[PDB]
């Protein structure tokens, strides 16, 4: 009756409820209303066992990494603005370097919250929201914004060093194109489907390489915004194009060592010589680092809306946006454990930190997992 008025799409949720190393929680201390409905790059971080965690509703915590008790707590709910109120609303992840919790916001601010209390020891604006977590190095806070601007904010006191537009997406798309520092150069992807290494110390282009397609005249992913953010383990830049299309290319020239222009790759990590990667089927697959040679793949994960495959307690850990943490065999794609600790779907990656597995979903904010 009332059921007959709606319309649906499809996913295949939780194959293999597994507890072979039976997961539990390390603690659960939920921050608030976290990662939200925006395109969000806010994710939990775990530092000093003083769990500097934040939501998008202002509230930034320092929980304690045994029970999640507040070592400090603040709120970035600023009391004024052109929405008449300004919460945290973080377009960047939690970057804790020094006495600064650097977080980039959709209030266009990249704060740096003092890790003893959480008070903003500096904040400096970026061009609108960020496509990027704050990347803090060389005296800079590397933000690649939604406007494509590789920005450099002074990580000690707050001062814009160089705001350099490199790769704005084709239709102002979203997705992570975070500026990674490699070989002294800020290496940026771009949801134009490209990737580029750029001399970070002024924003000077080392090279720009179009890899493959983005949205606009070749209509691709809005089911999962593909991180073109390159994981540059060594001078082969390993990255994705915005259509998921994986690439391995030179860091000083962008010359392609190999590339999967077949990539439906959502998340991707270089696990040794086996690039472990979440595809659009939400399967984990171990391609090589010198090819797309599948060292192993996964069928136990299938249409899951996964996070990135991380490692914790000897298993390949990946949560999903159905809120089910999973512990994959680090080899051929079998679960060892699976955990629903979520009150939500885990939009953010399992932060395998401090000997725990820290998480924060959109409303399933900070739990932490041991097995």
């Amino acid at each position: 009756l009332f059921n007959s008025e709606e319309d649906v799409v499809k996913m295949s949720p939780l194959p293999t409820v597994e507890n072979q190393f039976t997961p539990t929680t390390a603690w659960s201390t939920s921050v608030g209303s976290g990662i939200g409905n925006f395109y969000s790059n806010l994710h939990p971080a775990l530092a000093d066992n003083v769990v500097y965690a934040a939501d998008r509703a202002g509230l930034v915590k320092a929980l304690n990494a045994d029970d999640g008790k507040e070592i400090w707590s603040v709120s970035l709910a600023e009391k004024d603005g052109w929405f008449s109120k300004e919460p945290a609303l973080l377009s960047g992840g939690v970057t804790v370097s020094g006495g600064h919790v650097y977080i980039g916001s959709e209030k266009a601010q990249v704060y740096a919250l003092n890790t003893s209390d959480g008070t903003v020891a500096w904040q400096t604006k970026v061009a609108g929201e960020a496509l990027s977590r704050p990347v803090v190095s060389d005296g800079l806070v590397l933000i690649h914004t939604s406007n494509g601007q590789l920005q450099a904010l002074n990580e000690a006191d707050g001062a814009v060093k160089w705001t350099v537009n490199l790769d704005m997406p084709s239709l102002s798309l979203r997705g992570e194109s975070a500026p990674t520092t490699a070989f002294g150069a800020a290496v940026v992807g771009g949801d134009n489907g490209r990737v580029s290494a750029v001399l970070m110390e002024q924003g000077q282009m080392i090279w720009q390489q179009r890899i493959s397609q983005a949205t606009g005249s070749t209509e691709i992913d809005r089911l999962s915004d593909v991180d073109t953010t390159p994981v540059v383990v060594n001078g082969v830049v390993f990255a994705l194009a915005y259509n998921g299309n994986l690439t391995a290319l030179d860091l000083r020239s962008g010359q392609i060592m190999w590339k999967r222009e077949l990539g439906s790759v959502n998340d991707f990590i270089v696990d040794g010589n086996r690039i472990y990667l979440v595809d659009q089927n939400d399967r984990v697959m171990a391609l090589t680092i010198d090819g797309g040679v599948t060292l192993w793949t996964q069928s136990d994960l299938l249409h899951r809306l996964l996070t990135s495959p991380v490692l914790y307690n000897g298993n390949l850990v990946v949560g999903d946006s159905e809120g089910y943490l999973h512990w994959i065999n680090v080899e051929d794609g079998r679960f060892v454990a699976q955990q629903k600790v979520d009150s939500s779907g885990f939009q953010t990656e399992p932060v395998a930190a401090d000997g725990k597995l820290l998480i924060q979903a959109k409303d399933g904010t900070v739990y932490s997992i041991t097995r």
């Binding site: 319309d7 799409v9 609108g128 798309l173």
Partner: protein, 783 residues
């Protein structure tokens, strides 16, 4: 090799020689193996040959062909509210149709072309698979699966770089108000990128008036929320600063109207810059030069935006045309009525300079015409002179035919029915025909009504109305109030102005009665008739041949013939008696129609419908009780039965009606209800004061195929009918209505429905304040 015969294996649109001609090696031309491959591609260049296998029998060519042509059908599956012909049109954008070359390569071109269309639908979770289904001898059905999952939705517009206002007040001044703070309440939201395109200038025109000539929207970043649903947008703007209009320095060809053009651009220097006012003031000059004949006036304002004091300086560059642009005019869409009917509905004449609104008032007169569906023109400049424009008034005429019905359940009972039909100037004759009538046992009613509204050149509305009510109110015989009423009504209208038109007519009211109702207000007027008919009996007859003189006048400044939205109308109509009448009286009335738009989109316009009436004798008589006024039912106070609001007569203590139905049709009669019963139905007041307060209301959930003349229309209905001729000792222990303090009240909505049988109105109204002898019909059925 040289071919002696080309083997043609199936072509089906390209002919045998036409294939052979597309072969660069024809029969008799020498075969080369490069010509064979040239035969492949150039028969692939037929655009109809799916596969071409050019072989040869040594030299004798064997061209084995597969065929693209006629796609005999195209099937759609999953073709939801986004219509399959639009799904065919992106397939037609893929070059595909029925009866066509089917290259089987454009399958995904249909699909991804529709999936990109599905992106621009408002969805993104929407796919499509095209399926080839072969039909006889080359032909194909194109089946089409459409996998449409879900649609995208605009969630929140994050307008960054906003340094003058807040984003939310802009969103309030785009569309919004609050939602239950113990205050006002608002609605819902969805995605379309053109609403994004519209509000950004609603953003800018919110800046353009408050100052802000260097307001600029810097950039825009739609959030690709990874769901294909969440449309947040990060918009970069910059207010620049507030700006002032600090002076008008209008220049150019001001056509000798320079003070006037300056008067339209009389501004306050230093007043916060209103660019929206500035372009208006340009249009002020354009209609000024337009009404001065210059049909094509250049007016070019230029704010020299002086950022040094945060002001602007209005240069204006004006350049008018010439005066006598209306050389001649044309008339089209007058295939059903003549030109001179539509030609006389104008205020712009040829041989004149342009009065810019004389075209429009005549088009408003054509909007006030009512024999139309559209009012348009083609004001085309005939090239060759700056005094040369043809105004080709092309309009669409009337949709005719209208019906009304009542039922007496005939042929399952006594043959009893109520008829009535309206022809709405059938075929544009200039003859509006509406004819009704009914034959029951109670009545056999006849009526005629038609007019040529323009039968002579001065707007002679040649209207002769007829009537023959063979009305008896038969219970079994002529016992309860026979009235055989018969005669005519010839009436004429004449325009005293372009919006003012008079009326006058005459009535012949020949009535034939018997055994009238044994009651006061019946006999009381008949006591004023000089009769003293029997109180206690229905044995009393009446023959009146009333010779009456009718009159009236109308005002008409109110928009449309069948869906108006603004203006006012007054409609006087009354009557009086003359010598030769069998009764001396008057009866005066008036109708009004004034439209006040609260919404300036005119989806919400005040529509006040109220009715007045008064009538008495001309000395020594009364106005009849059958001409006394009533209300209730379909009236301006609905939610009632018919004739509820009004004075309530009293049956005298009555016997047989010359035949009394035994304990039926009670009139204080011999069988039941005796000894001074009160007539509970509204027998009529000789004065009237009733009202209905209606509103235009749009239908935001209805397919607007027909809503151009569909008006949902709420009301609060109230009023009285009362007799200034009412007794109060005859009605001592009975309803007295000598005063208009009988203010009834109802409220509800009218549902006007445009059928091909005209507008069909329906009502529900709950009367929450009533007076004596009112009856309530909430389920109100009208036509």
């Amino acid at each position: 090799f040289v071919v002696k015969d080309i083997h043609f294996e199936g072509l089906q649109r390209v002919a045998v020689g036409a294939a052979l001609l597309s072969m660069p090696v024809r029969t008799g031309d020498t075969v080369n193996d490069e010509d064979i491959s040239n035969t492949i591609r150039a028969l692939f260049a037929t655009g109809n040959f799916e596969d071409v296998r050019v072989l040869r029998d040594g030299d004798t060519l064997l061209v084995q062909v597969k065929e693209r042509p006629t796609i005999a059908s195209i099937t759609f599956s999953g073709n939801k509210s986004v219509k399959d012909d639009m799904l065919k049109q992106n397939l037609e954008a893929s070059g595909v149709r029925v009866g066509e070359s089917l290259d089987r390569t454009t399958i995904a071109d249909i699909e991804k072309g529709l999936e990109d269309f599905y992106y621009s639908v408002g969805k993104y979770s929407a796919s499509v698979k095209a399926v080839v289904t072969p039909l006889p001898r080359n032909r194909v059905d194109l089946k089409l699966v459409f996998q449409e999952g879900v649609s995208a939705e605009i969630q929140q517009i994050n307008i960054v770089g906003n340094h003058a206002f807040t984003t939310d007040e802009l969103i309030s001044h785009f569309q919004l108000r609050d939602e239950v703070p113990w205050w006002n309440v608002v609605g819902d939201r969805k995605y379309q990128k053109q609403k994004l395109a519209g509000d950004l200038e609603t953003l800018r025109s919110y800046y353009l008036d408050r100052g802000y000539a260097r307001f600029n929207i810097d950039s825009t970043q739609v959030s690709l929320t990874p769901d294909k649903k969440g449309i947040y947008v990060t918009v970069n703007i910059t207010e620049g600063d507030q700006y002032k209009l600090s002076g008008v320095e209008v220049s150019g060809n001001l056509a000798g109207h320079s003070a006037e053009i300056e008067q339209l651009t009389k501004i306050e220097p230093g007043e916060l810059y209103n660019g929206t006012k500035v372009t208006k003031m340009e249009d002020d000059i354009k209609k000024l030069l337009g009404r001065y004949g210059y049909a094509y006036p250049r007016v070019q304002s230029m704010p020299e935006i002086n950022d040094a004091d945060k002001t602007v300086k209005l240069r204006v560059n004006v350049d008018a045309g010439n005066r006598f642009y209306v050389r001649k005019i044309r008339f089209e869409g007058n295939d059903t009525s003549k030109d001179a009917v539509l030609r006389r509905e104008m205020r712009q004449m040829e041989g004149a300079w342009l009065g810019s609104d004389l075209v429009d008032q005549g088009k408003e007169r054509l909007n006030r015409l009512g024999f139309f569906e559209t009012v348009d023109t083609d004001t085309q400049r005939v090239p060759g002179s700056p005094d040369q424009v043809d105004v080709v008034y092309k309009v669409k005429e009337r949709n005719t035919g209208s019906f009304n019905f009542g039922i007496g359940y005939g042929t399952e009972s006594g043959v009893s029915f109520q008829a009535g039909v309206q022809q709405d100037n059938w075929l544009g004759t200039g003859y509006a025909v509406g004819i009704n009538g009914t034959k029951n046992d109670y009545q056999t009613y006849a009526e005629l009504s038609v007019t040529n509204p323009y039968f002579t050149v001065d707007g002679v509305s040649l209207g002769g109305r007829l009537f023959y009510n063979d009305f008896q109110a038969d219970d079994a015989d002529l016992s309860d109030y026979t009235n055989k009423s018969y005669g005519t009504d010839v009436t004429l209208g004449f325009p005293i102005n372009e919006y003012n038109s008079l009326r006058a007519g005459l009535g012949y009211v020949h009535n034939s009665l018997s055994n009238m109702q044994p009651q006061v207000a019946m006999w009381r007027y008949l006591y004023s008739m000089g009769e003293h008919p029997s109180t206690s009996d229905q044995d009393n007859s009446f023959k009146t041949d009333d010779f009456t003189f009718n009159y009236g006048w109308t005002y008409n400044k109110l928009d449309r013939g069948y869906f108006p939205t603004d203006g006012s109308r007054v409609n006087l109509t009354g009557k009086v008696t003359i010598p030769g009448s069998d009764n001396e009286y008057y009866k005066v009335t008036l109708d009004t129609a004034t439209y006040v738009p609260i919404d300036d989109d005119h989806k919400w316009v005040v529509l006040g419908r109220t009715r007045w009436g008064y009538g008495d004798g001309l000395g020594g008589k009364e106005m009849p009780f059958y001409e006394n006024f009533y209300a209730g039912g379909s009236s301006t106070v609905r939610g009632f039965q018919s004739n509820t609001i009004g004075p309530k007569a009293v049956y005298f203590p009555h016997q047989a009606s010359n035949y009394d139905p035994d304990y039926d049709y009670e009139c204080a009669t011999q069988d039941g209800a005796k000894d001074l019963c009160k007539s509970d139905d509204a027998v009529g007041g000789n004065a009237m004061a009733v009202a209905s307060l209606e509103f235009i209301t749009p239908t935001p959930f209805i397919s607007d195929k027909y809503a151009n003349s569909v008006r949902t229309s709420f009301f609060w209905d109230m009023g009285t009918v009362w007799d200034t001729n009412w007794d109060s000792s005859q009605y001592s222990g009975y309803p007295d209505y000598s005063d208009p303090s009988n203010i009834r009240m109802s409220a509800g909505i009218a549902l006007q429905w445009m059928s091909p049988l005209g507008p069909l109105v329906f009502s529900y109204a709950q009367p929450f304040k009533k007076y004596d002898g009112d009856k309530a019909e909430q389920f109100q059925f009208n036509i």
